[PDB]
Amino acid sequence: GIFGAIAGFIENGWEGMVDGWYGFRHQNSEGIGQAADLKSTQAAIDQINGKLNRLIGKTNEKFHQIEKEFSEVEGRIQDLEKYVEDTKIDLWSYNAELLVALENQHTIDLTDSEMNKLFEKTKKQLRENAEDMGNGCFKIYHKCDNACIGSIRNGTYDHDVYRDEALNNRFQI
Amino acid sequence: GIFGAIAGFIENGWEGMVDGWYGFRHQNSEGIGQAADLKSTQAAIDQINGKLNRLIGKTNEKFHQIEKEFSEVEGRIQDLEKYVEDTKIDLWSYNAELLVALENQHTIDLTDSEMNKLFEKTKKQLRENAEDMGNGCFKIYHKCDNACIGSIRNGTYDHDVYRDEALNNRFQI
Amino acid sequence: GIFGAIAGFIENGWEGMVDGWYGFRHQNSEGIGQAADLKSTQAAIDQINGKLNRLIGKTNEKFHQIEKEFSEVEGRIQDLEKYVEDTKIDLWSYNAELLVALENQHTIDLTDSEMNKLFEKTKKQLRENAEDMGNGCFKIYHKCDNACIGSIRNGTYDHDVYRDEALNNRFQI
Amino acid sequence: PGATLCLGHHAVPNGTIVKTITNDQIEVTNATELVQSSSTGEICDSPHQILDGENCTLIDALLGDPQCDGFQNKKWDLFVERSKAYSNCYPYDVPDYASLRSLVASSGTLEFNNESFNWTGVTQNGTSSACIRRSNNSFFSRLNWLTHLKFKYPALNVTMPNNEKFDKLYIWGVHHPGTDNDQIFLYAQASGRITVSTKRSQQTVIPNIGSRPRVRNIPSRISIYWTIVKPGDILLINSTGNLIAPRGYFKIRSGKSSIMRSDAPIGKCNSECITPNGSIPNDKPFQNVNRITYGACPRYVKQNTLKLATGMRNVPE
Amino acid sequence: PGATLCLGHHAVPNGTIVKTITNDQIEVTNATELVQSSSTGEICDSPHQILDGENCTLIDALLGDPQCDGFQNKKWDLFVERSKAYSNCYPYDVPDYASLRSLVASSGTLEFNNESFNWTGVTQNGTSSACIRRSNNSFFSRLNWLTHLKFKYPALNVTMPNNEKFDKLYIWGVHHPGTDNDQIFLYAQASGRITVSTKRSQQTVIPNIGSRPRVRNIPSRISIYWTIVKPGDILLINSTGNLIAPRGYFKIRSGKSSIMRSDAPIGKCNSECITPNGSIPNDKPFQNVNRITYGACPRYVKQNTLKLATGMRNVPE
Amino acid sequence: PGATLCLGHHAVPNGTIVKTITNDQIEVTNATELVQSSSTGEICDSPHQILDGENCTLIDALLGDPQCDGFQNKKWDLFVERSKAYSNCYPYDVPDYASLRSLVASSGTLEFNNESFNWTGVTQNGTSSACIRRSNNSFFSRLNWLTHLKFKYPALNVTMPNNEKFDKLYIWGVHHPGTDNDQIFLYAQASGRITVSTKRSQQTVIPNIGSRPRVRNIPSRISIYWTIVKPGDILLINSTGNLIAPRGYFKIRSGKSSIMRSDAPIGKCNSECITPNGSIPNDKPFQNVNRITYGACPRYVKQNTLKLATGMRNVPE
Ligand SMILES: *[C@@H]1O[C@H](CO)[C@@H](O[C@@H]2O[C@H](CO)[C@@H](O[C@@H]3O[C@H](CO[C@H]4O[C@H](CO)[C@@H](O)[C@H](O)[C@@H]4O)[C@@H](O)[C@H](O[C@H]4O[C@H](CO)[C@@H](O)[C@H](O)[C@@H]4O)[C@@H]3O)[C@H](O)[C@H]2NC(C)=O)[C@H](O)[C@H]1NC(C)=O
Ligand SMILES: *[C@@H]1O[C@H](CO)[C@@H](O[C@@H]2O[C@H](CO)[C@@H](O[C@@H]3O[C@H](CO[C@H]4O[C@H](CO)[C@@H](O)[C@H](O)[C@@H]4O)[C@@H](O)[C@H](O[C@H]4O[C@H](CO)[C@@H](O)[C@H](O)[C@@H]4O)[C@@H]3O)[C@H](O)[C@H]2NC(C)=O)[C@H](O)[C@H]1NC(C)=O
Ligand SMILES: *[C@@H]1O[C@H](CO)[C@@H](O[C@@H]2O[C@H](CO)[C@@H](O[C@@H]3O[C@H](CO[C@H]4O[C@H](CO)[C@@H](O)[C@H](O)[C@@H]4O)[C@@H](O)[C@H](O[C@H]4O[C@H](CO)[C@@H](O)[C@H](O)[C@@H]4O)[C@@H]3O)[C@H](O)[C@H]2NC(C)=O)[C@H](O)[C@H]1NC(C)=O
Ligand SMILES: *[C@@H]1O[C@H](CO)[C@@H](O[C@@H]2O[C@H](CO)[C@@H](O[C@@H]3O[C@H](CO)[C@@H](O)[C@H](O)[C@@H]3O)[C@H](O)[C@H]2NC(C)=O)[C@H](O)[C@H]1NC(C)=O
Ligand SMILES: *[C@@H]1O[C@H](CO)[C@@H](O[C@@H]2O[C@H](CO)[C@@H](O[C@@H]3O[C@H](CO)[C@@H](O)[C@H](O)[C@@H]3O)[C@H](O)[C@H]2NC(C)=O)[C@H](O)[C@H]1NC(C)=O
Ligand SMILES: *[C@@H]1O[C@H](CO)[C@@H](O[C@@H]2O[C@H](CO)[C@@H](O[C@@H]3O[C@H](CO)[C@@H](O)[C@H](O)[C@@H]3O)[C@H](O)[C@H]2NC(C)=O)[C@H](O)[C@H]1NC(C)=O
Ligand SMILES: *[C@@H]1O[C@H](CO)[C@@H](O[C@@H]2O[C@H](CO)[C@@H](O)[C@H](O)[C@H]2NC(C)=O)[C@H](O)[C@H]1NC(C)=O
Ligand SMILES: *[C@@H]1O[C@H](CO)[C@@H](O[C@@H]2O[C@H](CO)[C@@H](O)[C@H](O)[C@H]2NC(C)=O)[C@H](O)[C@H]1NC(C)=O
Ligand SMILES: *[C@@H]1O[C@H](CO)[C@@H](O[C@@H]2O[C@H](CO)[C@@H](O)[C@H](O)[C@H]2NC(C)=O)[C@H](O)[C@H]1NC(C)=O
Ligand SMILES: CC(=O)N[C@H]1[C@H]([C@H](O)[C@H](O)CO)O[C@@](O)(C(=O)O)C[C@@H]1O
Ligand SMILES: CC(=O)N[C@H]1[C@H]([C@H](O)[C@H](O)CO)O[C@@](O)(C(=O)O)C[C@@H]1O
Ligand SMILES: CC(=O)N[C@H]1[C@H]([C@H](O)[C@H](O)CO)O[C@@](O)(C(=O)O)C[C@@H]1O
Ligand SMILES: *[C@@H]1O[C@H](CO)[C@@H](O)[C@H](O)[C@H]1NC(C)=O
Ligand SMILES: *[C@@H]1O[C@H](CO)[C@@H](O)[C@H](O)[C@H]1NC(C)=O
Ligand SMILES: *[C@@H]1O[C@H](CO)[C@@H](O)[C@H](O)[C@H]1NC(C)=O
Ligand SMILES: *[C@@H]1O[C@H](CO)[C@@H](O)[C@H](O)[C@H]1NC(C)=O
Ligand SMILES: *[C@@H]1O[C@H](CO)[C@@H](O)[C@H](O)[C@H]1NC(C)=O
Ligand SMILES: *[C@@H]1O[C@H](CO)[C@@H](O)[C@H](O)[C@H]1NC(C)=O
Ligand SMILES: *[C@@H]1O[C@H](CO)[C@@H](O)[C@H](O)[C@H]1NC(C)=O
Ligand SMILES: *[C@@H]1O[C@H](CO)[C@@H](O)[C@H](O)[C@H]1NC(C)=O
Ligand SMILES: *[C@@H]1O[C@H](CO)[C@@H](O)[C@H](O)[C@H]1NC(C)=O
Missing domain, CATH: 2.10.77.10 (Hemagglutinin Chain A, Domain 2)
Incomplete structure (x- = not known):
């Protein structure tokens, strides 16, 4: 949320995008289409897998410890045993609570960041040939068929090819 | 600070804005005015209230514990009682210190983020009708009376209405 | 990494920049040059020094404690002494691990942020006289000699001086 | 423009x-x-049940020092012990005092039930000038100082079954006289040995005759001991002298009670x-x-x- | 478009x-x-070595209660103690029971080595109807109940050197008879005092004659003690009666072993x-x-x- | 361009x-x-005050083993105990050794003040060949081995008031002779019982005659005890033999002192x-x-x- 794309200027997610986490929808002369972006998807997944690698399957071996349940009343020594354990448990419980809250804030922010980065990259690529409509969509001011849209998604779009056409369309009356 | 608006490209805050945390000042044909933006203000407040809800009025009940002050010298058992408590206190003191440092860094960053998000939204809304002066201000290249400024603040500004006028003003010699 | 400049749209760092952390390279009529930006460099350094001031030279004095090594088998009291210490050490070890992971994530992000902020500032300064090439570089559409490049780096560049020349070059056929 | x-x-x-x-x-x-x-x-009196000890420590209230009679059978969430508290009965010590104090504090009750112990053959209800209750010589209210009857003290072998559904806490003592004269005057024989037992525990204590520094003019001492008796177990007291006997038991509860030292009003x-x-x-x-x-x-x-x-x-x- | x-x-x-x-x-x-x-x-039997105590506590397995003979010399990573476990031998107590239980649990072995103690002058291998092993009167397998020989019990002053490279754990006991009659019948003299020592430690225990509440019809008790003897040190046992003698030693190891209370299969x-x-x-x-x-x-x-x-x-x- | x-x-x-x-x-x-x-x-000698124990443990320095005379009245922030340290005086043990070591370590001083105890009726300053000081038979410097005077050892009932503004730490001992012969030779009567008391505490210890394994050829032992006496309280020592008497008291301070085991130079x-x-x-x-x-x-x-x-x-x- 801190970058402002997911749950921000992107109105909502796409339930029909099932082969990636981020991607592109377009409308042109040949129809309306959708394609996932693999690099942004993998960037987010890699980071989340990084967190998981640091939390899952990493336990600590302990063996003989202290007693933690007692059948008889004893006073001072048992009071101390119980307090040591209660102290420990509360500290670990705090660590767990904080860990999850911080990690989740960070996951939401890093995924928002990857959406924003893909948007910014696409904006720069289009140069003077498109305008940002404010909702994650670009109005492209030239004929842009399926191969042209593909060139944008693959990073091979040559803005100079279309610039005269686009400027004429943008800056008319 | 990490977004670069508050204490960054926005030179300073406005002591005269008392009905919101973020907002707009303008100059046009009809004068100079100020208006708070409620949605950004509430977004920041909501997040801060979220932190407070997790810290305030959430205490932990404890009853019989161990002794923590001693009138006589005893040696081994008392050394252990004192060490358990000193250990506990230092761990909690660390938790408190870190909690406040992290939360405060995050509060400063999230409030900066809300300022940046409002600026970006406004930039996109204005399309080709304005230019960013670098200091959080836009030069709007068309006559923009009080109702027009109001339309910008309320998200009802139709850039197409003014685009011919604006382009003519921007791209002259 | 969360801002997208360092290890993102900036392809790589400059091993030949040894007098600052961030800066400018240019090509113009008079050659190719490099200059460090001191303000962004100092902003990053100050933040990192802030972290160091909170971690280095800040130790805690402890005196008489409990025994932690034992020459004879004793049972209950020794089990408790050992458990208290093992508990303490594991909690501190966790704190240390988390502290370093979080601080390092934050350092990478804050340094990325300072790069992005300098890029954004420069973009705004250039107004309609340049275009972002997508890789941290601007194509400047007017003759821009060494003094002109210097004016950009020093914040004294007057975009109005060059705007007619630049617009003519940008928006030709 | x-x-x-x-x-x-x-x-x-x-x-x-x-x-x-x-x-x-x-x-x-x-x-x-x-x-x-x-x-x-x-210290706010609400919403926790506060018991101000005033002049009494918890252990003095337990044993029944004459300044603590108002405390009988009271319960608390928090017992507040004042620094001015002092004892004014027969001088005593409690080996493992801290533990008895803790376990009673945590139980949160001074509820006491009298029992009819069979003390045939001895004189009951011994008193002392070191423990004044309303100008008369007295003793701890929850303890029973047994002495000779007609210069005889026969061997005691006294039983008390726990046929309740809860545990019983017994408080008892051993009297250490200041001299061999005192030993004879009180118990009519040389000091022996006290054994208090159950099916799962045994405690034996040896009276040790001798002068200790006088406290409120008394050079003898009582040492206080305790025994918990579980349901269907049985208390057995075996003595030939020097026994400060229980009068009954305290209920022992579990819950949220504790004790705090404070002089705050x-x-x-x-x-x-x-x-x-x-x-x-x-x-x-x-x-x-x-x-x-x-x-x-x-x-x-x-x-x-x-x-x-x-x-x-x-x-x- | x-x-x-x-x-x-x-x-x-x-x-x-x-x-x-x-x-x-x-x-x-x-x-x-x-x-x-x-x-x-x-509780999964793998990959830790699990020892189900079944009817036996660890301490009963140690001493050698007749239901625990299958446990001799066994090792474990985790000893599992069941809530149904009960003792069926001579009634005993262990001062500092929790510590003995802990140190044996942590050692992770019941490995026992018999030694030839010189008990000349007394009758060995005393048994009781309170400890039945295959319908015969018996006793703890690791302990040796010594009684008079021809109405004599001479003073014992018995040595056992540790010439091993490891520490030895000795378990021993003191018998507290129910009556003066029993004392005489068993040991032929008035109760004395047992002293077990090494170069670096000494423990003396006083037998205390008296009735305790009967457990499996027995009013007497045994109290269990232990002694660790380091390499090149020497165990010395000094008694004139009431000694429940060791038969040898347990090996004491260090490692990852422990004990847990559980009724899980x-x-x-x-x-x-x-x-x-x-x-x-x-x-x-x-x-x-x-x-x-x-x-x-x-x-x-x-x-x-x-x-x-x-x-x-x-x-x- | x-x-x-x-x-x-x-x-x-x-x-x-x-x-x-x-x-x-x-x-x-x-x-x-x-x-x-x-x-x-x-281990840097600055800025903490370091006391290298060399051949002496803290407790040997306290008692006054003849290798530790250079330690008298010294203070420390950190006492460093070496693994090579060994005792070379009369063989002793300290029940709760760890606690005495800890409380002295934490006090940070061996400051000792001699007091004039009234030992009328016994021989003072007993020595042994097990504790050589400059080729002569000697004893712990801070302890006073009392024996019979002309085959009499009268009952001791000796007082020492604390009229200081600080607490006093008294170290004392009980001698356990190897045999009944030794008991008679030293104290002229059968072993008794030592009682050391104040207004707020009492400790009684029973000498236990018997052979322990010989240490530096000595089968007897001394057991060491301590007593803290608060201002306006009074130390009372009551004995008929076997008393290893104090010569005075140690000051007990509070502060930042401790002890560490290390062989680092x-x-x-x-x-x-x-x-x-x-x-x-x-x-x-x-x-x-x-x-x-x-x-x-x-x-x-x-x-x-x-x-x-x-x-x-x-x-x-
Ligand atoms: C929601 O998010 C979670 C977390 O990212 C995803 O859960 C992961 O899903 C993957 C794919 O199913 C899992 O990968 C598989 O892990 C198995 C190990 O299972 C156990 O062990 C781990 C710890 O050791 C436990 O955390 C886990 O709960 C299990 O008890 C492997 O055995 C699997 O191997 C299979 O595929 C590989 C591919 O090479 C082959 O070698 C084999 O043929 C085999 O069939 C596999 O690697 C992963 O464990 C899950 N992680 C967690 C933490 O649960 C969810 O998929 C995701 N949901 C959605 C809808 O996206
Ligand atoms: C600086 O930032 C802080 C934190 O955000 C702001 O402090 C909050 O201010 C609000 C508005 O005054 C407070 O709201 C009021 O809380 C009362 C509870 O007071 C006690 O209880 C809480 C915990 O239970 C303690 O934290 C607190 O210190 C008090 O001891 C309510 O009783 C109030 O009710 C009143 O208004 C409601 C409106 O519906 C009505 O029902 C009643 O009529 C009643 O009069 C009210 O809700 C809030 O407690 C403050 N929080 C904290 C943590 O202090 C500062 O306002 C802000 N300063 C500036 C200048 O912006
Ligand atoms: C990689 O990143 C690290 C951390 O930012 C940099 O390390 C710092 O480098 C600076 C410059 O060399 C160091 O500054 C010097 O500190 C000395 C203190 O040294 C000890 O004390 C501290 C703690 O008290 C320890 O952390 C440290 O390890 C040492 O044991 C001062 O004495 C120095 O004084 C000198 O310069 C000053 C300038 O005014 C003069 O007064 C004197 O003449 C004197 O000669 C100096 O201030 C700093 O200590 C380093 N910090 C750490 C944590 O190590 C690396 O430089 C950096 N590497 C690269 C390649 O950029
Ligand atoms: C062993 O020695 C102690 C200490 O010397 C003896 O105790 C002391 O006994 C005397 C009397 O013999 C007590 O004196 C009394 O003092 C009170 C104080 O007001 C006074 O009212 C009496 O008239 C009397 O003078 C003294 O208090 C007491 N001291 C202490 C510290 O207890 C003890 O009697 C000796 N024991 C034996 C068996 O001899
Ligand atoms: C001290 O008092 C206790 C308790 O009164 C005495 O113990 C009790 O002794 C009687 C016999 O004198 C025991 O009775 C037996 O009960 C069993 C139960 O089935 C029965 O089989 C026998 O035929 C006999 O009746 C009784 O169990 C026992 N009670 C307890 C609690 O142990 C003890 O003997 C007295 N000691 C002395 C030295 O007098
Ligand atoms: C109880 O038994 C112990 C052990 O058997 C007896 O202690 C031992 O006593 C003998 C002499 O009777 C000691 O022998 C001496 O050895 C030294 C070593 O160099 C030598 O210099 C002497 O000439 C003599 O041979 C032996 O060391 C000692 N052993 C131990 C382990 O202390 C003890 O005397 C017996 N007690 C009674 C009361 O009989
Ligand atoms: C594991 O076992 C423990 C047994 O103590 C369970 O915790 C107890 O739960 C009951 C209610 O079911 C409470 O009355 C007890 O007070 C609890 N005991 C303690 C010591 O906390 C626990 O629920 C079991 N957990 C699972 C998942 O089976
Ligand atoms: C609450 O009470 C404690 C009483 O111990 C106060 O802490 C003591 O403060 C004095 C100085 O005023 C120190 O000399 C003591 O060493 C402190 N004692 C301990 C145990 O730390 C404390 O200041 C009081 N707090 C308030 C807010 O009244
Ligand atoms: C400091 O001293 C300790 C001495 O205990 C060292 O830790 C021991 O290291 C050895 C292996 O070299 C292990 O076998 C021991 O089990 C360790 N002991 C404990 C108690 O953990 C430690 O390596 C030394 N550290 C340095 C940096 O010299
Ligand atoms: C039960 C009994 O008769 N106790 C008597 C006691 C004891 O003899 C000593 O206090 C014990 O040492 O002494 C008195 O002088 C007293 O204190 O009033 C008379 C009192 O009646
Ligand atoms: C070694 C020996 O002879 N023990 C005998 C014991 C003991 O006298 C008491 O159990 C001790 O109090 O008593 C028996 O009746 C029994 O228990 O079977 C006979 C048994 O032989
Ligand atoms: C005060 C005294 O006379 N002590 C004597 C001791 C003791 O009799 C034993 O050590 C106690 O068991 O024995 C000696 O042979 C010795 O050790 O030198 C002679 C010494 O003088
Ligand atoms: C959603 O549904 C899918 C398919 O049934 C399932 O595999 C997945 O775990 C579910 N996700 C959540 C978050 O419940
Ligand atoms: C873009 O990349 C995909 C690979 O997934 C390829 O199939 C497609 O033909 C490419 N299109 C263009 C126009 O470069
Ligand atoms: C600032 O002043 C106002 C009005 O006096 C007060 O309510 C508020 O708490 C003050 N804020 C701070 C941060 O001191
Ligand atoms: C903008 O919104 C406000 C509501 O606060 C309204 O009063 C105002 O008339 C609106 N103006 C325009 C031009 O839409
Ligand atoms: C890199 O090399 C320089 C010069 O040798 C050295 O001072 C510096 O510490 C090194 N940095 C790292 C990260 O190894
Ligand atoms: C820019 O600033 C530097 C100061 O480092 C100065 O030397 C240079 O002449 C300045 N150039 C211009 C064109 O302002
Ligand atoms: C216990 O009571 C019995 C029977 O009255 C008696 O034989 C014995 O002496 C008493 N024991 C003690 C230690 O007082
Ligand atoms: C120890 O044994 C010796 C020698 O047989 C004997 O003199 C002494 O009485 C025994 N001591 C005890 C306490 O049994
Ligand atoms: C204590 O001293 C007194 C008086 O000299 C004497 O009667 C008594 O026997 C001594 N007590 C002991 C235990 O030595």
């Missing part, structure tokens, strides 16, 4: 300094304190968190008033202030 | 709620649970983490099954669920 | 790998180590943090040298390295 539209944020003339990860002093528009550092100085007010310095508000997560607490309390920390930012960076005009 | 190109992100119809720093309920596309909250209910399965409720998977970092654990286990926390986001915010159509 | 203006950042040819939240290995331009993992191997150097491995620098927040520390020390952690990034991500050409 056109227009100018500026985006901005508020600022205040009276900002507050907070700590962050990268700066120990940054000004924000507002902050809130997370460390409770003050008390009014009174008790007030008519309502507070969930008690410290020895008085009750404290518990809105904040941390406190630096006292490491000793009872109830729903903020956690003790060493810092006297921790300010949580509740507003943006303050960047004044 | 031109084209439109929209950037976006996925969403799911079945999102999950997680907690963050600023919101206690935000929906994300996916999450994973970090708290293990269930067990199958069985032992299963043929493989799990690294044991709790009293059964084994639990250890993929997750935390667990709320039991504070009592053995092996590679998640850390105990109070929360029953902690969901880690593994996807972005879910923003449905 | 125009110009090109590129924004960028530095990189280095020799980056360093650090851990982050999302990646266990990312290269940054620079980092700093947060775990101190080395010592020079010497003491160096002429200045370091605030001491471990058994030697002093360590304390610039870093953490250390993995030793869990045992004294002074202003980094906190012990299990990690041997924790690298804090001090530069951006390194993205080489």
